[PDB]
Each structure stands twice: as C-alpha cells, then as structure tokens.
Design a protein around this ligand. Structure first.
Ligand SMILES: [Cu+2]
Ligand SMILES: [Cu+2]
Ligand SMILES: [Cu+2]
Ligand SMILES: [Cu+2]
Ligand SMILES: [Cu+2]
Ligand SMILES: [Cu+2]
Lengths: 333, 333, 333
C-alpha cells in the first residue's frame, strides 16, 4: 500500500551538479517526489551567437539528473506553463508501461500532471519528451535528461566489492540540427513553431551542426570547469538521447565503466574510450592520480573540437613523477 | 560420416515470423535442409510510393530467419531463377571458410547450388549476398537476413540458469540509399541494372534515405504489429547487415541482451538501449509486464521517426498500477 | 628508483608488422626506450592518385605499434626535424596525466623531447598527435598509432586460461576528409598549411572521403596481404583514433575479442563483428581452420568496398570439408 510509505521531496539542481542523495539507502523504499517545469526558451549555443528555440525540462539542457534507489517510487509533477506554446510529455527509460509514461503525461500549455512509477531496475537511464509525430524535434531541441536508480547497497565493482564516489557530475550531450540556407548560414527564428519543415529537413541529413555538453560550446570550461582533487573518486554520468557518443577523459581513464549504464552488470575495467549508444545513459568511475587540466570529450575529435563536445576538469594536488615525467623538455637539436 | 545423420527439411516462413524449432535439442546433430529462391523485385518502401529494385532471398526484406542448433549441419539449396538479371551468392557469418560460403555459391540466373556448412558457434548471425565488386549494392538492396544457431541446451542467463522464450520475432533493419537528383527527388528505374553509378554515388554519402523494419515504412504496424500478452517471454532477434543500430523497446527493456549476438557470452541485463554493430545480429529477451502499445525503434529517433526504423507491439492483459499510474491526469492549472 | 632498472632499446618496424617482444615477461619491470621521428610527407591514398599531405609518426600511417608489459616504463624520444613545417606532440591513451603526455611533448620543427610514463593498465591503446587548436586536423592527417601493454603473464581467456598467439598484426584504420570543390573533385595542395579552413569544412561534414587500412586503398592486398597457416593463432590489433569501426573477418570470426581493448576484462567469444569506438584500440584472437583468401573489413560495407576499409589474409593449408563443402557446384537448372 503506497500510502503507507514515506514521502520525500527532492529539490533539483542545475546540471552538471546533482542533487543530494545517499549511495547506500538509509531508509526503506520511499515515494520520491520531483517537480519539473517545462520552459521553452531562446538559447545561444556557440561563440558566434547562434540562437535556437530550446525546449527544456526545468530551464536547462540537459534536464536535471534525478536520483532514487531501486524499488523506490518516482512521483513526478510535470508542469507546462501557459507561457509555452507546445504540447509536451515525458518518457522515462527507467519506467515500465505506457511508452515510458509518455502516453500518460501529455500536457498542453497551462496544464500539469503527476505520474508515478516504480524504479524496478538499477542504472542510469535517459528521460526525454516524446509527443506523437514530433519526437525527434523535441529531443533534439534539448528536451531530455537522465535518472539514476542506485542499487540499495550502492555501486559495486566486478568482484562485488563496494565502489563509493566522492563527487558526481552529470554531462548531457546534445546534438543540434540548426537549419541552414543554401550558402551554409544558420537560420534564426522568432518562435519554436517557425522551424517545423525546415527542422525535419535539417534532421534528415543525420549531420548535427553542433554537439555540446551542458547546452553550449564551452559550457564546461573556465569558471564552469568540473573540479576534483588528486585521490578523489569521481562518477561521471553521461547521456545522449538521440545519437551515439564515445566519451574519453584525456589524461585519464574510465577505471570502472558501465557503458550502457546498468548496474546489475559488472563494469568494464580500464577503458580509454567507451561507446554510449544513442538513447542511453552510461557512467564512468575514475580516481584522479595527477593534478592539472583534463579534457573530457566525445572522441570523434571533429565532434569534440569542431562541433563542441568537449569540457574540462581542473584537478588540484600533487604531481607524481613516477607515473609521468618530462625526462628532456622540448629543445633544439 | 555425414550420410549417417538424420536429414530434416525446413519450410521457411516470412519475417517477422520464424519457422518452428525446438529450443532444447530433441535429437542428436542433424543435416538441416533449407531452400531459398532469389527474387529481384520492385518494392514500394514508403508512404509516398517510392519504388526500388530490391534483391531478395525468398521474396522478402529481410530474408527469412533460419534456425538450427550448434553442431548441426546447414545445407542450403540456393536457386537463382532465369527471371532474374544478376549473379548472386551467399555469405553466412555463421560459417567457416570460403568467404562464409560466398566463394562457393556464385549463381547466375538459371543456376542453383547446394552449400553445406557446420554450425560450430552458437549465436544469431547475419547472412548476406556478396558478389565480387558489387557487395554493398546487393546488401543495401535488401539481400540479407540472419541465422540462429541455438546451443543444444537452449539459452541461459548470466548465472547459467535456463531462459525459455514463449514467442520469437525477427526484425531485419535495412538502410536504403535511393538516388536523388539535385533538387532532392528520388529517381525511379525500370531495371536493377539502371542504377549502378548512381547507386555508388548515393551510397558514398553514407546517409541513408530510408531505414526500415521488414522492408517498408510502417511494415510492423497496424494489422502487422507484433503481439504478446502480459507475462509472455519474447525473444526479438534484430539484424543490420551494413550499418549500426541501437534498438529500444519504448515502455520496456531488454531484460537479457546479447547485443552482438553470441550465446557463449553472458547476456547484458536490464538494457534500455543496446548497440548492434553493422554486420551483426543481436537478440533481446523481455518479459512483458504491462499491456498496451509499445514502440520498438532504432533510438536514433531521427532514424526511427523520420526515416522509418519503428515498429509496434500490441500487448494484451492486465494493467499494473504498482509499476506505473497516473496520479493526477493532465488538467488545467 | 628508476635508474636502477634495466633499460632496453626497441627498434620499431613498419605496420602491419610488430616489433619483437615476449608475451609472458622474461624480466622484471624495465624502462623500454623508443624513438620516433615525425615526418610530414605526401601520400597517395587511392587508385585514382589522390595525394594528401600526411602527418606521420615514423613515416607510416598508422604509426608503429609499441609493445611493453604492465608496469614497465615507456620512454619515448620524439623528434621533429627541421624539414617539417608544423608543431606536433603526442597523447598516449595508455598514460596518466598531462593530457596523455600532450602538454609535455610540444615540439617545433628542429626540436626533440623525451617523455617517460608508467604503463599501469594492460590493453591496447591509441596514441595520437593533439596540438592545441588543431587536434582533429593532425589526427585525420594520419598522425596516430597504438601501444600494447601486455599483462606480465600474457593474455588469458574468459576462464583465466592462457591464450598464446603465433602471429600478430596491427591494422590501423584511417578516416580521411579530402576537400572537394562544388563539382566533387578533390583538391591537391603544395603544403600541409595550404588546407586549413578547407580542412575544417571537409571535416565538419562528418563524412570521410576515404577510410583505409595501413594508409591507402588496397595496402593490405597482393604481395602485402596478411598471411597465416591453418592451425595458427593470430592476434589482430585494430585502432581507430577518430571514428567508430566494426571489424569482421569474412570467412572467420573473432574467437576471443576485446572490442574496447582492455585485457583485465574477459574477452567476448565467437564474435562475427565487433564495434571499436573512435578513440580506441581493440584486439581479436582467431585460430584459422580453413585455407584460402579472407577479407578483413569494416562491416559498413560501403566503408569497406567503396571507401577503402578492406584488406586480405592469404592462408595456407588443408581444406576441411566437414566445416564447409560445396555439395552441388553452381550449375544450370
Ligand atoms: Cu517537448
Ligand atoms: Cu526513448
Ligand atoms: Cu545478390
Ligand atoms: Cu559480411
Ligand atoms: Cu601533429
Ligand atoms: Cu585521444
């Protein structure tokens, strides 16, 4: 009887940060309450000032990471304010039935709905909007995020021993298909409805114009680089709702990787690069051993360095000359 | 001595259905006899009436699923009637030697041949036509299917416990490259030979014009949706002879997945989406828990919903409100 | 104290061959010394005579395979002669810190440097050039290779039993983006610097013009086919620094495959085809059972047979009619 269960309200945070949670469950099963408000908004996605009409959960691309434990119930209040123009819904890949919830959560502007589902399988999972006839358009306008369903006893390695992370970040990777004219310049529009046939044509090329982390070129750089210290254990959750990616930590590794995101499987060890298929969330665990700047990229390096799928970590601490050293610094022959 | 073995004749069925077989072998090793007749034919592949010259095994795209057990012998009588125009052959990825059989099965119109091979490795495997100099053209005209080599003791989970399916379906996914003129309209042709240089150019774009299940947009919908009941265990075999795909059951999961199709490996558990590389067959096992319509898609959602790689399941039975429920149906604020 | 360790000098060989090494380590940890000289050079990459300005480690595309054991130190002397025009560096995916070494190995023409790192994780790994602001351009001009870090006790199967290879080959797969004019003809250039904005535009299409093994169409054919004998155990290391590939041995299998290349994981068994993500090296072990010609391909068959990603094995020995035979050779009905 669900009404006998504790309820807990979560207040979400903006990616790449993740709301507070406990790895090992400190309570029995609960109903975990979340609220998200849909926001259609203009977003500038590159250095050149290219502007799109983004479709967001809670104002960000990606939407926020939700965290529960296996056999909790997720109860989502989804709000579509009357300042929006389009119908939206939500499909959770974590959920069972009704198109992931999509068939039950169609909200017009000015409506809201509350969906409950049981989180029966542990892992990281994509969620995304999916309105009938308009699915890729909403997804590729930014309307996707992820949910993490932790095992009740937290994460385990390939030998069943505990893995505990000190920090967690969520990297949402977004492929955009900004329409171009014949000469190759992007079109700008007053409303989201002003793209539709042009959006379909752009999408049908299967060639993104931009591929970004956290909604824009350079979003995870500068004052907004990810941070860690030497010795810290970091979990990086990465999602791609529509298109394959291949993450890589330049200067590091994925010590334990669940490339397709599902924690009942043993992790793959010592990965250089891993493939997260489109429509999937994955997770990588790494312990930093060297200080300095790292680049976290999609290792199609054109996608990384020309299209935008690159971020930075800035790591503090002690350099280890045993692991790497410059024996003879660059100099003339 | 092969002549001392039983012979059994199989009569194939059209995809997505699968001919009758036993999961656990009820006999010793056998010579399993199959006959396929090659048919070049016009196929309408979309709602707009786009017509191609398809190259088929047994009249369908994909070709039919063949089912044997490990250490059976497969004996295929391959017929190329004189009503066809092209030379064809067959390469079985299940087989060892002679380019999968391709070097031994070149048949001109008006010829036939009989190939035998031993099915030494368990799994699902692609088969496809592969004539020297014309390989991608034949494959991407539809001339591919799959073969399942079951372990003699049937399928097993990650703990070595039995997995028994109640129903099986075969989803062949086909990338087509229909040539376009400068303005973007498809060209139509009187004969298969009328494409060749234009076909090569279309293929070299690496951008399919259509990606379909069972040979056409919408083929696995309506009266031709896949069916199941709540509680039934379903195996879905999926193949892609040329290009990566990432299947996903919208509203469900792959409870046990062999993404690259080979049954001596433990399955991956609880998959949302999985990557089947081009040139591979994979298999997913799911037990339905909720009734209703499900969409089975390639989760590049542009490929699914714009290019055609989407089908439906229609599931009968009892809705489970514990797993999912609408707490507050969509309504005005 | 590293100065107390033995030093051993390796003399590299041209791909697809691999320098001499021992699978099971016959010594304790060592400092393994390598020297590579960067060469910018014109390369003809296809049958039509298309010429690019390649950027190479040691004169070849790919760069040579380096082989060490886990917990050895790699000490690389990297030389950029004054006959080159560009700055270069090196990032080892095997290494920890400083962008894989890239931050420590920037060499102008006329400079050299010596980097040391500890090979702490076993596997095959990509290495590539990565100069700030010019990363994909250098990589997709050929400036990448791989390093194998063997476990000290050699390779093991999924049951922890030894796997010993008789022969090893290294297949580097390269995506090139040769700029085209409006009509579709390739542009030719006097210097590497003559591409830059045109190179970026070509890359941004995400559509390679050529995908080759060992630096050219047909490089691993004819007198340069790979060779083996029936009964021989062969390890094929395959790398792709920028773009996914899906290798397949036509007529064979990957008996044991580490698709993402990391030897602390059990291999996948009986693969038909496997996905090596861009930015990764993988390895496949096969025992030949049939003589004849095999084709080793990327199983996007357009990429193989139209764009160049195909090579051959020529295998000597005894045909096994139990595994495959032509029962009735092609003939008229
Ligand atoms: Cu939406
Ligand atoms: Cu989805
Ligand atoms: Cu054919
Ligand atoms: Cu094949
Ligand atoms: Cu370089
Ligand atoms: Cu790299």
């Amino acid at each position: 009887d669900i009404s006998t269960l504790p309820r807990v309200k979560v207040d979400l945070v903006k990616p790449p940060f993740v709301h507070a949670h406990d790895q090992v469950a400190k309570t029995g099963p609960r109903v975990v309450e979340f609220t998200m408000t849909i926001e259609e908004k203009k977003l500038v996605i590159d250095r050149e000032g290219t502007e799109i009409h983004a479709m967001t959960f809670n104002g960000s691309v990606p939407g926020p990471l939700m965290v529960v434990h296996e056999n909790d119930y997720v109860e989502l209040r989804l709000i579509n304010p009357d300042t929006n123009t389009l119908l939206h819904n939500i499909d959770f890949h974590a959920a069972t039935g009704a198109l992931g919830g999509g068939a039950l959560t169609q909200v017009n502007p000015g409506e809201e709905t509350t969906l409950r589902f049981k989180a029966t399988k542990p892992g990281v999972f994509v969620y995304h909007c999916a309105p009938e006839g308009m699915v890729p358009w909403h997804v590729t306008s930014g309307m996707n995020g992820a949910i993490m369903v932790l095992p009740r006893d937290g994460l385990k390695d390939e030998k069943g021993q505990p893995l505990t992370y000190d920090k967690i970040y969520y990297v949402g990777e977004q492929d955009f298909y900004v329409p171009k004219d014949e000469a190759g310049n992007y079109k700008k529009y007053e409303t989201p409805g002003e793209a539709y046939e042009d959006a379909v044509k752009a999408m049908r090329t299967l060639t993104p114009t931009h591929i970004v982390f956290n909604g824009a070129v350079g979003a995870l750089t500068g004052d907004h680089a990810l941070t860690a210290a030497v010795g810290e254990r970091v979990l990086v959750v990465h999602s791609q709702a529509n298109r394959d990616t291949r993450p890589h930590l330049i200067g590091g590794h994925g010590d334990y990787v669940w490339a397709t995101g599902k924690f009942r499987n043993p992790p793959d060890l010592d990965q250089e690069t891993w493939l997260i298929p489109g429509g999937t969330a994955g997770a990588a665990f790494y312990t930093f051993r060297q200080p300095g700047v790292y680049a976290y990229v999609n290792h199609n390096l054109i996608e990384a360095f020309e299209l935008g799928a690159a971020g930075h970590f800035k790591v503090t601490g002690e350099w280890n000359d045993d692991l790497m050293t410059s024996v003879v610094k660059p100099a003339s022959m």
